[PDB]
């Protein structure tokens, strides 16, 4: 009941994700090292992690079917507003409900200049998302749907974005119906869209604490140019 186009879309997103997510963490070595001893001691490392992750999210976004049809401006607006959300999403793959250096916990994030106001709901998110035990097919569709959202502020051709997203949305809904067996499939789509809603709230809180954090020039100094451009300066 999955059309050939929908199977095409899944194959494309799977490969796109495989080409942008290295589970071996080979590149983490090139980041400024994590410091655990420590005010904002993890900021340099996590900033590089996030900067790296933005690059990977962009590479993924470009391979989303239809994304190349949007204008340069709309591509920018979608990536700027969704970046942190897709990084939180993709990070679920490394999250465990149970390396050692690149295994991050609450205190690490706290040492990057954030409070429990963000960290608590972020952990709730990760646990709740993990619980869904999504197929990888569903995981990559959710990231793409997150990126191509009509309602992002600054979108010009919202009708086009929405049309590109509906195609991705219909592919997910059909995949679940045809490929994800119950009970695991029970209301799975609704629960995935709720995760996207959770992500909007996580996005807003991160934005707040990022403004506070990056207000001090001595902390802004510890960020990267890409982070400053995408998250703001």
């Amino acid at each position: 009941k999955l059309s050939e186009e929908q199977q095409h879309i899944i194959a494309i997103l799977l490969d796109a994700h495989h080409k942008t997510y290295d589970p071996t963490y080979a590149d983490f070595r090139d980041f400024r090292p994590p410091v655990r001893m420590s005010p904002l001691s993890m900021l340099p490392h996590l900033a590089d992690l996030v900067s790296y992750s933005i690059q990977k999210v962009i590479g993924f976004a470009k391979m989303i079917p239809g994304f190349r049809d949007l204008t340069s401006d709309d591509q920018i607006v979608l990536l700027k507003s969704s970046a942190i959300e897709v990084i939180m999403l993709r990070s679920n793959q490394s999250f465990t409900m149970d390396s050692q250096d690149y295994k991050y916990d609450v205190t690490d994030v706290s040492k990057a200049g954030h409070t429990l106001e963000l960290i608590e709901p972020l952990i709730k998110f990760q646990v709740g998302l993990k619980k869904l035990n999504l197929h990888e097919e569903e995981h990559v569709l959710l990231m793409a749907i997150c990126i191509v959202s009509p309602d992002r502020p600054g979108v010009q051709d919202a009708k086009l974005v929405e049309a590109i997203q509906d195609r991705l949305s219909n592919t997910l809904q059909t995949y679940i119906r045809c490929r994800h067996p119950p009970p695991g499939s029970h209301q799975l789509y609704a629960k995935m869209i709720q995760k996207l809603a959770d992500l909007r709230s996580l996005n807003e809180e991160h934005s707040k604490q990022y403004r506070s954090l990056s207000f001090q020039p001595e902390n802004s100094m510890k960020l990267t140019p890409l982070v400053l451009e995408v998250f703001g300066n």
């Binding site: 962009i58 920018i76 990536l79 451009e229």
Partner: peptide
């Protein structure tokens, strides 16, 4: 603002 780096990475 302008986003040269983001612009460049999006091709």
């Amino acid at each position: 603002k302008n986003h040269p780096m983001l612009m460049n990475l999006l091709k």
